[PDB]
Design a protein around this ligand. Structure first.
Ligand SMILES: OC[C@H]1O[C@@H](O[C@H]2[C@H](O)[C@@H](O)[C@H](O[C@H]3[C@H](O)[C@@H](O)[C@H](O[C@@H]4[C@@H](O)[C@@H](O)O[C@H](CO)[C@H]4O)O[C@@H]3CO)O[C@@H]2CO)[C@H](O)[C@@H](O)[C@@H]1O
Ligand SMILES: [Ca+2]
Length: 231
């Protein structure tokens, strides 16, 4: 069986297992993102985490949102990682539910590896699952898939299953993307390490672009729960 080993149901408030980033990071968190992350953009309403992105100026930036991570408190090697999410859809939006390797502090990005469980940009009628890494030739590599989602603004369940053989991606239980990590094939050795969880909503960047629907603010991403199971 899958055994639950960690969760935030956001029933009281936000678990002390979450840490919050501040500001725009290095060149927009690596992606020329336009937001300044703050703690105040995360609230709880009726058992849901609420990440509000706002048209709000601070530190020379013009948008605020939240970026929260489980880093230095909780991390896992293999398992089922899952969140029930309702996210906004507007030009410039870039919500993400994803994982980074613990060793990012030592080896950096992209050596540490990332598992994107869910990304969405703009008003696309789909969501994406991706892995990012350094292959055995030390080249930056990613492998992505998508599934049609007509209403990202309604709750969906975004899931990975992760073992020594494979990573699989699901939306509402529908398999749509898969990647072998067996024997570190294609240089995937670093996906056999501990990874922590992140939640964020970025505004603009290299992928969503720099056309921002300024009449979409404030914008809410709601997270009913995050859960990790293991064998
Ligand atoms: O600290 C030493 C040097 O750091 C350099 O800044 C780095 C930073 O170290 C590192 O964390 C960052 O990695 C990010 C990367 O740039 C960015 O592209 C990536 O975007 C994510 C996607 O890849 C994907 O996984 O989906 C998520 C969510 O949508 C994206 O956020 O995320 C990486 C981790 O945040 O790289 C930047 C460099 O631009 C800096 O160069 C140097 O001066 C420092 O000395
Ligand atoms: Ca909840």
């Amino acid at each position: 069986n899958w055994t639950l080993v960690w969760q935030d149901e956001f029933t009281n408030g936000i678990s002390s297992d979450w840490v919050f980033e501040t500001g725009n990071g290095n060149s927009g968190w690596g992606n020329n993102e336009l937001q300044y992350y703050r703690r105040e953009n995360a609230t709880v309403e009726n058992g849901n985490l609420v990440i509000t992105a706002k048209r709000e100026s601070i530190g020379g930036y013009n948008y605020t949102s939240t970026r929260m991570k489980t880093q230095g408190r909780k991390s896992w090697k293999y398992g089922k990682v899952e969140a029930r999410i309702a996210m906004p859809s507007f030009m410039g939006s870039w919500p993400a539910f994803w994982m980074l390797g613990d060793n990012i502090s030592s080896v950096g990005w992209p050596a540490c590896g990332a598992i994107d469980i869910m990304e969405h940009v703009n008003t696309e009628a789909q969501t994406h699952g991706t892995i990012h890494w350094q292959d055995h030739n030390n080249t930056y590599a990613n492998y992505s898939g998508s599934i049609p989602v007509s209403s990202v603004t309604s709750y969906h369940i975004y899931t990975i299953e992760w073992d020594a053989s494979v990573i699989k991606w699901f939306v509402d239980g529908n398999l749509y993307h898969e990647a072998s990590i067996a024997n570190g094939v294609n240089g995937t050795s670093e996906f056999h390490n501990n990874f922590f969880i992140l939640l964020n909503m970025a505004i603009g960047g290299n992928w969503p672009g720099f056309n921002i629907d300024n009449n979409a603010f404030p914008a809410r991403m709601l997270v009913d729960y995050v859960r990790v199971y293991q064998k």
